[PDB]
């Protein structure tokens, strides 16, 4: 079936008792991105220890889940009764087998058959692909995907942009504005390692007639070098239109006083992230 919600699969002639010498395979097919749940309402077959005579063989996704026979209530039989039988993919193969004689080991017997009811269900693509394993490239999502019926769609963590493929995310970190009186500014995902290949302009614009006070916090960790300062990563600071220092390293830079109402912290990263980053408190005073 190309597209179907639910359905019924019965033994032949149901409810009328089933004919002997019969084996038929019916295959349930829900559309792409759905699982197949099913249960039995009525179940009345020829019982046999190990189901030699008659049986219902239900198999899903290259594995036989069940081969079951007997009556709903009777022992010495392996009946499903009402148990859930879910597939993983979108296909569930059912088979029904019956020899020539169901009416011998006692005397005449009248066996009705079975009522299979099957629902479609949605599968959780996220928890399927990302639960364990999988280091090679697969179609799985970077920051978070979403599980909804049928398909799945993706989204990124606060302050990141989704790229065209709708699977991965870069940082935006271009027009990061700050107009409040005090505040905190931190490199993206602090104190975890900062993303590489960035052009950040953390802009502070307070009401004119104030002076800004920049207080760097610990830790302050950026890839530096003892020969030349800031070759890979740079944290430039512009104040009042002009640069006032390009910083990188391990000890925090000095607490800076600007005499300005407009500052811009420019952040340039390399193509690797080992160091953690930086965080600062900016406060306002009067002139």
């Amino acid at each position: 079936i190309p597209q179907k919600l639910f359905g019924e699969v019965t033994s032949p002639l149901f409810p009328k008792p089933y004919p002997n010498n019969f084996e038929t395979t019916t295959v349930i097919t829900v559309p792409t991105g759905y699982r197949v749940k099913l249960v039995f309402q009525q179940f009345d077959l020829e019982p046999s220890e190990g189901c030699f005579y008659d049986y219902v063989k239900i198999s899903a996704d290259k594995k036989s889940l069940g081969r079951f026979c007997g009556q709903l209530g009777s022992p010495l039989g392996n009946p499903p009764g009402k148990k859930e039988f879910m597939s993983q993919g979108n296909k569930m193969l059912l088979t029904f087998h019956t020899d020539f004689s169901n009416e011998e080991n006692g005397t005449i017997m009248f066996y009705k058959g079975f009522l299979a009811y099957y629902q479609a269900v949605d599968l959780d693509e996220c928890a399927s692909r990302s639960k364990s394993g999988e280091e090679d490239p697969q179609p799985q999502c970077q920051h978070l995907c979403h599980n909804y019926v049928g398909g799945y769609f993706c989204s990124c963590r606060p302050g990141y942009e989704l790229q065209e493929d709708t699977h991965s995310c870069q940082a935006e970190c271009s027009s990061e504005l700050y107009t409040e009186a005090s505040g905190y500014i931190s490199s993206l995902e602090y104190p975890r390692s900062y993303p590489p290949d960035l052009r950040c302009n953390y802009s502070i614009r307070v009401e004119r007639g104030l002076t800004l006070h920049l207080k760097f916090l610990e830790p302050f960790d950026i890839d530096d070098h003892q020969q030349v300062h800031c070759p890979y990563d740079q944290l430039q600071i512009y104040a009042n239109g002009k640069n006032i220092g390009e910083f990188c390293g391990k000890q925090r830079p000095p607490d800076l006083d600007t005499s300005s109402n407009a500052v811009d912290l420019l952040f340039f990263t390399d193509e690797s992230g080992d160091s953690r980053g930086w965080k600062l408190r900016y406060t306002t005073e009067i002139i």
Binding site: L5, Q42, Q119, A120, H146, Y148, V149, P158, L177, Y184
Partner: protein, 276 residues
């Protein structure tokens, strides 16, 4: 126009939101779907009873929730911070902010997805008399053996006619057997053989339990075999009163089963064969 999924962000996300705003969003999914609305990010101006600034969840007329404050997800295995599930196909979300923000507040980021309503289980009232079937986007009812579903698409009813037995050796039982027989019903089963044969009915003395007779001995519920001029019955009580092997001397037999409104019991089962 209705969708199965969607995104709702605070204005200017993930920057600071503007003051003196009242923005509303109307969530809508198709018929017979519930809604799961969950928040991936929450940083809003904190006030008691979320007075100053707030994000509001209203279903119909009633307030399903109201959030404010600075909050992040405690579980590292899940991004969800707050969440709601509703049995309705529409929702409303209202974000409002007063004229000032003392600190910088990034707002909120949330998403919604449409879920199937399992009409059988999700409600206390089940809309099927006998058996309920859920499917993605709706439901429909079903019935036990030799029951037929009534016009209202909801409740079922028993038939016990239309079946003519032509087999030489066969079985007959009361409806629902071994469960109790239905009340206020007349069940007639008919056997039709070749002229030369006799229908002989066997039923186990223990496989018979029908509502007992009154003090005077008249069966309030009864079972009776009609063979042309001869008639066997009425039979009732716990245990079959007749012999385990009964000869009707007839090739065509009508078995009638009468029940009143209350006073039901297990029922009966039988098997018949032929004799020249």
């Amino acid at each position: 126009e209705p969708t199965m999924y969607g995104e709702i962000l605070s204005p200017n996300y993930p920057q600071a939101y503007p003051s003196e705003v009242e923005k509303s969003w109307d969530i809508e999914v198709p018929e017979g779907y519930g809604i799961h609305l969950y928040f991936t990010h929450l940083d809003i101006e904190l006030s008691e009873n979320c007075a100053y600034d707030s994000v509001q969840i209203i279903s119909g007329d009633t307030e399903e929730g109201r959030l404010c404050g600075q909050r992040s997800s405690n579980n590292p295995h899940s991004p969800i911070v707050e969440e709601f599930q509703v049995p309705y196909n529409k929702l409303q979300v209202i974000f409002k902010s007063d004229f000032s923000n003392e600190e910088r507040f990034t707002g909120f980021a949330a998403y919604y997805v449409a879920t199937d309503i399992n009409e059988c289980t999700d409600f206390v009232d089940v809309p099927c008399s006998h058996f309920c079937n859920n499917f993605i986007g709706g439901y429909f009812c079903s019935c036990p053996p030799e029951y037929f579903l009534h016009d209202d698409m909801k409740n079922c009813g028993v038939n016990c006619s239309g079946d003519v037995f032509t087999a030489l050796i066969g079985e007959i039982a009361s409806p629902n057997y071994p469960k109790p027989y239905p009340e206020n019903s007349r069940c007639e089963y008919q056997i039709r053989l070749e002229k030369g044969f006799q229908v002989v009915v066997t039923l186990r003395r223990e496989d018979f339990d029908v509502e007992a007779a009154d003090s005077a001995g008249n069966c309030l519920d009864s079972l009776v075999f009609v063979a042309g001029d001869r008639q066997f019955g009425p039979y009732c009580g716990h245990g079959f009163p007749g012999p385990l092997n009964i000869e009707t001397k007839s090739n065509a037999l009508d078995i009638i089963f009468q029940t009143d409104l209350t006073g039901q019991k297990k029922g009966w089962k039988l098997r018949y064969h032929g004799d020249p």
